[PDB]
Structure 1
Amino acid sequence: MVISEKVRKALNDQLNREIYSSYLYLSMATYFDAEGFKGFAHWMKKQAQEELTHAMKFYEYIYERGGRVELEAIEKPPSNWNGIKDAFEAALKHEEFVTQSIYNILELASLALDHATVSFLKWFVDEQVEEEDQVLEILDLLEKAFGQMSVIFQLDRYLGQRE
């Protein structure tokens, strides 16, 4: 049941990356709140909470497999963006990086014939598709506002509904 160290290290690295992800989304919330979009800010706070659930999934899996977690320093995230689109494009680029990190754990797990970790990671592959899809949809809806503040505010209301 004991997990290989190279896979352990990769999962611990990912845990720390999910923590930074949470912090980055909270920083995007600080931007939207300062720009007066409480709905966009709400969506970001929810996303920050979701990223913490990802981190704790990795946390508890590592201990299930006999490893231990070492928390690393969290870098200072950006706190400003040149507009709503710029913020969500930054979120999409961030998620693309997370997705490629997940595939690297998948590669290391299979090289170790660690099918338990391969199975564990399947949820995260599906979740990355979902999260990229949601960010693409927001970018699409924003593009289709064609700069009209009436539409942009209705989008703020919509994203403010996130459960």
Structure 2
Amino acid sequence: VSQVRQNYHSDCEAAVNRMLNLELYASYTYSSMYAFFDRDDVALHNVAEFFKEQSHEEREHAEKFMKYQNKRGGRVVLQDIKKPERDEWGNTLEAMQAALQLEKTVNQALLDLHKLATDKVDPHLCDFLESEYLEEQVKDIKRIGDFITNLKRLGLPENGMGEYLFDKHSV
């Protein structure tokens, strides 16, 4: 037993490791979206950079879980980072729709972890999730939803002019 460990359930420790992996998975998916929008036959640079930024943010989320694990006396256990679900992302609307679903998947995992922490009476873990993850998730989901509404308004997927306009005025 780690000398620092106090009120940290084995189940929570394991769930933190799984959450870390999911953050890394999300990062990798966003990196794929970056590379797609940087393709010469796609060429939406501001969209690409948005997803690149998101990729870096997700990596930061993962690293914060690593630090958390050690602070509580848990042990970081890593697993493979699975490649993204797709190799190409269609267009800005399709990519944003996938990003929304990804963000909701990550959010659900965070909420499930919060429920576990609650069940195990771990207020430190609850506080950590609330203060460092849950509000950022809601903000990101709202931003992506707002983008999707605008992409639909702009006539995506069919309206190429609309897609250009979004890249030039929304990101």
TM-score, with structure 2 as normaliser: 0.87
State the partner residue of 1:28: 33
**Which amino acid counterpart does residue 99 of structure 1 have in structure 2?**
N
Return the structure number with greater relative CO, CA threshold 8 A, min gap 6.
1
Shift of 1:107: 1.2
State the partner residue of 2:164: 153
The residue matched to 1:95 in structure 2 has which SS? helix
What is the CA–CA distance in structure 1 between the aligned matches of 2:72 and 2:151, rounded to whole Å?
44
Map 1:31-110; keep pairs closer than 5 Å.
31-34=36-39, 35-77=42-84, 78-110=86-118
State the partner residue of 1:13: 18
Match of residue 139, structure 1, among 148, 157, 162: 148
**Which amino acid counterpart does residue 138 of structure 2 have in structure 1?**
V
Shift of 1:138: 1.1
> Which whole-Å deviations, capped at 9, do the CAs of 1:76-96 have from their partners, x for residues lacking one?
212212322111111111111
State the partner residue of 1:119: 127
Tell me the percent identity: 31
Number of residue-to-residue matches in the alignment: 160
What is the CA–CA distance in structure 1 between the aligned matches of 2:169 and 2:136, rounded to whole Å?
21
Q: Is the 8 A contact 1:40 1:159 kept in 2?
A: no
What is the CA–CA distance in structure 2 between the aligned matches of 1:10 and 1:65, rounded to whole Å?
13
Q: Is the 8 A contact 2:92 2:163 kept in 1?
A: no
The residue matched to 2:38 in structure 1 has which SS? helix
Shift of 1:159: 5.1
**Structure 1: tracts of 5 or more residues without a match:** none
